[PDB]
Amino acid sequence: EYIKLKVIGQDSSEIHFKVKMTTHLKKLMESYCQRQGVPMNSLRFLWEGQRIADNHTPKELGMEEEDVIEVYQEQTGG
């Protein structure tokens, strides 16, 4: 169990996580959606600009303690 992360967003609550270092970030992304009401395809999870995907590992990107993840909502335009 290696690392603290804060996940924030616009019309979304602040929620602190406690993710293991080599655990795939899908769980993080999923638990957050649940807690929100929102569908999993509905938000994009950005760390420092870069998109996190489901398989991505906090090790693999060199996340750091108290790093913030950022939540944006799907955007469409005509």
Partner: protein, 223 residues
């Protein structure tokens, strides 16, 4: 210009299956059927397709020796308008914007796409809107950003007296004629502009490009 095999793929892609099936993975984006469906006629494109497509331009230019391109997330420009240079400071990390020849920033005005071309070689900012609106302050904001990056990352003031902007007028560039194709012009404006190519196209080409694009995405290749 497509084949039967290609036209089949495109069809099997464009409907009939699980909302969430993964169709193409790259640039650490996962393009899901529901995403690809945004490429269907008159459908508005979501960020996922335009981010994916932008990245394909970069990999295109790289393989045909086109000008060095750097591509910004459709999210970048909201966030920088929202909470300033400081909000988007990290976003540009493993990268020095200033060794790149062309910077493409897609604008997501409300329910509507645009584009800013930042041309390092010309020290110029070009705003394009398929719907004919002016990009005056989109522009001032982004330049101000480059000042800030130049200052923050290179430690060099920018020579703002050498930098020009111009937003392209309804007659200068191709306009859209439906209420759905902007995100396609945004993409095609990127494509021509990233090859130093004058814009020969028109709305009438856009449905093929649409059909064509889902191919490009699936096969992660451009035509």
């Amino acid at each position: 210009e497509l084949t039967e095999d290609m036209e089949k793929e495109i069809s099997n892609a464009l409907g009939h299956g699980p909302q969430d099936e993964i169709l193409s993975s790259a640039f650490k984006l996962r393009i899901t059927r529901g995403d690809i469906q945004t490429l269907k006629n008159y459908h508005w494109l979501n960020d996922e397709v335009i981010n994916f497509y932008m990245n394909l331009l970069v990999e295109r230019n790289k393989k045909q020796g086109y000008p060095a391109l750097h591509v910004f997330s459709t999210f970048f420009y909201p966030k920088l308008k929202s909470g300033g240079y400081q909000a988007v400071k990290r976003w540009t990390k493993g990268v020095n914007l200033f060794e790149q020849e062309i910077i493409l920033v897609p604008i997501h005005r409300k329910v509507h796409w645009s584009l800013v071309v930042i041309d390092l070689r010309k020290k110029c900012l070009k705003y394009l809107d398929s719907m004919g609106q002016k990009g005056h302050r989109i522009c001032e904001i982004l330049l101000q950003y480059l000042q800030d990056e130049s200052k923050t990352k290179r430690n060099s003031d920018l020579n703002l007296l050498e930098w020009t902007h111009h937003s392209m007028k309804p007659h200068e560039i191709p306009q859209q004629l439906n209420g759905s194709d902007s995100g396609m012009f945004t993409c095609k404006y990127a494509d021509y502009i990233s090859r130093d190519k004058p814009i020969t196209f028109t709305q009438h080409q856009m449905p093929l490009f649409r059909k064509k694009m889902v191919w490009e995405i699936l096969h992660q290749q451009l035509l």
